[PDB]
């Protein structure tokens, strides 16, 4: 996250960090065995860490719970990124409490001009390279689609919106990938992709959640 603040330890109660032996990815649990992440972050041998502040210290709230399965979205674009979804079930139900929380699902969309958090341990630097140990945030509007659309030309699906400032200096980055934008306490968007990050003209763009609510329910109800 360039340009945010320190969230404070679990106050975002919902994020998760995916570790392969290291932090790679965030997500958002949605309910006690399930986890929301972008299809991009998928890869194998992945661990779940929930109750995290710092990623590089214990400090006494985690949960770490292997994954015993991941399903990409079946129409997941790896070159568009269309449908940049995945669903990871957790080995072991999470026990629940106030720092490790589900985030409810959207039942409708949200609008442009709709104030967002947006979290994550990704880079914190728009031109060099600095990870934080501790959780970042950042608050952000939705965009409207043209001006998301204008941004980039012929890239922004239906399943995509952007957040964030045109002006630049406030977006997420990458090892924000995966994570959260949480909207008047709804999971409506996941960090997906945007040129460099906290560029002018370049927000981000998210995955549009509310499109997959049907596809989250029966997977879960399945699997
Ligand atoms: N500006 C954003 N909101 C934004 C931009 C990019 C990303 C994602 N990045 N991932 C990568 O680059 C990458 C991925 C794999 C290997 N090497 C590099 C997220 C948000
Ligand atoms: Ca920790």
């Not at 404070?8 to 065995?33: D, E, K, M, R, W």
């Not at 929380?101 to 609008?111: R, V």
């Not at 967002?116 to 728009?126: A, F, M, V």
């Amino acid at each position: 996250i360039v340009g945010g603040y320190t969230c404070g330890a679990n106050t975002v109660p919902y994020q998760v960090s995916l570790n392969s032996g290291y932090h790679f990815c965030g997500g958002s649990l949605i309910n006690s065995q399930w986890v929301v992440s972008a299809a991009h972050c998928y890869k194998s041998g992945i661990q779940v860490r929930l109750g995290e502040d710092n990623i590089n210290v214990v400090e006494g709230n985690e949960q770490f719970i292997s994954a015993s399965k991941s399903i990409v979205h079946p129409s997941y674009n790896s070159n568009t990124l269309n449908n940049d979804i995945m669903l990871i079930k957790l080995k072991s139900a999470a026990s629940l409490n106030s720092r490790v929380a589900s985030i409810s699902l959207p039942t409708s969309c949200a609008s442009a001009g709709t104030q967002c958090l947006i979290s994550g341990w990704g880079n914190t630097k728009s031109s060099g390279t600095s990870y934080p140990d501790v959780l970042k945030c950042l608050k952000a509007p939705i965009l409207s689609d043209s001006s998301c659309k204008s941004a980039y030309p012929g890239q922004i699906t239906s399943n995509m919106f952007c957040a964030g400032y045109l002006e630049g200096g406030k977006d997420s980055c990458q090892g924000d990938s995966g994570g959260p934008v949480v909207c008047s306490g709804k999971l409506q968007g996941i960090v997906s992709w945007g040129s460099g990050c906290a560029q002018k003209n370049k927000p981000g763009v998210y995955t549009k959640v509310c499109n997959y609510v049907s596809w989250i329910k029966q997977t879960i109800a399945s699997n």
